[PDB]
Curated annotation (Swiss-Prot), chains B, F:
Sites of N6-succinyllysine modification: 12, 58, 60, 72
Record's subcellular location: Nucleus; Chromosome
Gene: H4C1
Family: Belongs to the histone H4 family.
The species this protein was found in: Homo sapiens
Protein's name according to its UniProt entry: Histone H4
Region of the whole protein represented: 21 to 103 of 103
């Protein structure tokens, strides 16, 4: 019936997610990933729920800002599409590596 | 035993939403697994420090303060959870 | 005037700030002016941020500063943005900024 | 009867009532404000401690806080914080 | 006569200057620049010679590393030539630029 | 009186030598002035802090230690000058 | 007259002799080693300071230095560091 | 001396002094300077080890700062410990990017 051109819903989603502040990763998958990574460091560990909220707030903030730098690296290479190599350039310059 | 198969709970549409808030229009197919590796390295570095703090307090429960202190350790200070 | 805040004309607690400066292993001895100056700087920056975040709140039709108003505030002010440049404000989001080349022509 | 947890909340509500007398603040917002105040507190105190140590002084005086503020704050914010601090010290000293 | 293809002496100079550690800015121009910048902060000031040496070591290390990152941005844009946009992208990511 | 005309003492061949040590093969013509501005801002930020330290020590001579302390302040720690 | 400035120069030499008896060191390189020790000293000490404050303790004990070393140092470097630390503490208390 | 009793070359006395004179905490335990002095000695030896190696590779008997720099930047973990540090007079590692090489 009706079909939007590629980039139209993408741009609509940018405006949408830049308007809100809610976490974008689903809470239970994230929690299970936190418990797994921590398990591989020390067994039988409990988490305050706020400690997982703090790890998720920070983690999502890190990835948002990293996607910002990644986007600039893509644009720097006259591209519109972010690629693993843009992430890697970003992290290298940031001195994360 | 070895724990595995959880990182994939950070799904393709979730990474996409984060990219959107970051202003990203178009996303290569290889970005998703790459972002998983990045987030694991990040979570590893921070949780390692959090646990180090937890250990030192002789506790079995990781507190929000342990994480906050660890974020601060890495130069990633976080407001709204204590400190 | 019994309180040291009153004697200084501050809303921020000079006594508590003097306590924290001593119980904090900053130096052997803490001068009498230090807590006053510090409590006053703290007050100034506090007011600076509340100003801009009450403004954000009002632009958004709200009676209450929520953390997004603090984030809008900090990240639209160059100097607050810099003071908090390695800081992450829970639940505050980002500034709306779409890159030009991404706009349809 | 839960443990006393100190906060800058009451002062933050004061300043906010001076500057926006009809504006409120949520839990999380106040937590951020409280982390801001602690953060900047630690940063200034730390730089003062270093200044004293660098000059072989045993004492942190308002002069150390002042220089701490000049190294730490950007331009205009420093200017204003310095005058608002010197003003408080001058008072305090006379009264 | 004789002529090397463009880029050969560039590579020779890369190999050469990544082999050595001596400073690459002439000392007196740098010193006069330091004094000029400092005057705009406080008038009538003296500098220890070692203080200027410290400023030059630090400044040059900063510029060398920044040129590394700039080079990576240029290569990122399929280019061999560094351009002001590579520097600006580098500093943007480093968090120096906004 | 207004001070100027010293930054150009950071010459083109000097910026070129720096780029070479950074591994740069080819250099645009607009890079040289750009590198002059960047180096100015850097020195500004560092010398400002250095002078703030000298002032506080009530001195008229900027010491290597003032510079070291300022570099450290800026996250650019330098070894070999009194660290 | 004369003015006294302390440095770790003599101890760096002493250790250099353990690891490389037949090699020496320039003054510049010596000043870097000095910077390095001070810097690492400050960094561990600062972390240990914070650990104490976080836990509401008035004392920095080996246990704070030990945790400090584990927050600070990377992996393999920490493991060895904790060993030499615990080792020297043991040898010290058993020589009282 | 406390160094011998601990078996260190590094001065336990001086480190205990500095920890007290440094406003780190009210009180400094008796094990703290020993542990710290030992860590400091260990890292010292790690860097001297690798930089005497650099010196020998470079046909020198004496460590200059370039040898310390070669040492630190070729070692991953030292490179990371000193990642925001600048080693006067140490230069860079020889590294030309591939695409810049003639084919």
């Amino acid at each position: 019936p009706h079909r939007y051109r590629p980039g139209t819903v993408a741009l609509r989603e940018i405006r949408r997610y830049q308007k809100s502040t809610e976490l974008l990763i689903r809470k239970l998958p994230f929690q299970r990933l936190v418990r797994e990574i921590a398990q591989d460091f020390k067994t039988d560990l409990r988490f305050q729920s706020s400690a997982v909220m703090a790890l998720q707030e920070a983690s999502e903030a890190y990835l948002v800002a990293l996607f910002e730098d990644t986007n600039l690296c893509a644009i720097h290479a006259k591209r519109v599409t972010i690629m693993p190599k843009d992430i890697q350039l970003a992290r290298r310059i940031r001195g994360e590596r | 035993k070895v724990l595995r198969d959880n990182i994939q709970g950070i799904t393709k549409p979730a990474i996409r939403r984060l990219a959107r808030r970051g202003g990203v229009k178009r996303i290569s197919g290889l970005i998703y697994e790459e972002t998983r590796g990045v987030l694991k390295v990040f979570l590893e570095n921070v949780i390692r420090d959090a646990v180090t703090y937890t250990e030192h307090a002789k506790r079995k429960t990781v507190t929000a303060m342990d994480v906050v202190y660890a974020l601060k350790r890495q130069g990633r200070t976080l407001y709204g959870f204590g400190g | 005037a019994k309180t040291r805040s009153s004697r200084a004309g501050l809303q921020f607690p000079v006594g508590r700030v003097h306590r924290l400066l001593r119980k904090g292993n900053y130096a052997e001895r803490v001068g009498a002016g230090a807590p006053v100056y510090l409590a006053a700087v703290l007050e100034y920056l506090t007011a600076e941020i509340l100003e801009l975040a009450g403004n954000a709140a009002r632009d958004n039709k709200k009676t209450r500063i929520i953390p997004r108003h603090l984030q809008l505030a900090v990240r639209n002010d160059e100097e607050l943005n810099k003071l908090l440049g390695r800081v992450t404000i829970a639940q505050g989001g980002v500034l709306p900024n779409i890159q030009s080349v991404l706009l349809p022509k | 009867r839960k443990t006393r947890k100190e906060s800058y909340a009451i002062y933050v509500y004061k300043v906010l009532k001076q500057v926006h007398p009809d504006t409120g603040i949520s839990s999380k917002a106040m937590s951020i404000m409280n982390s801001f105040v602690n953060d900047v507190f630690e940063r200034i105190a730390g730089e003062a401690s270093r200044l004293a140590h660098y000059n072989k002084r045993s004492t942190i005086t308002s002069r150390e806080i002042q220089t701490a503020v000049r190294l730490l704050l950007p331009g205009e914010l420093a200017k204003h914080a310095v005058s608002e601090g010197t003003k408080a010290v001058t008072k305090y000293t006379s009264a």
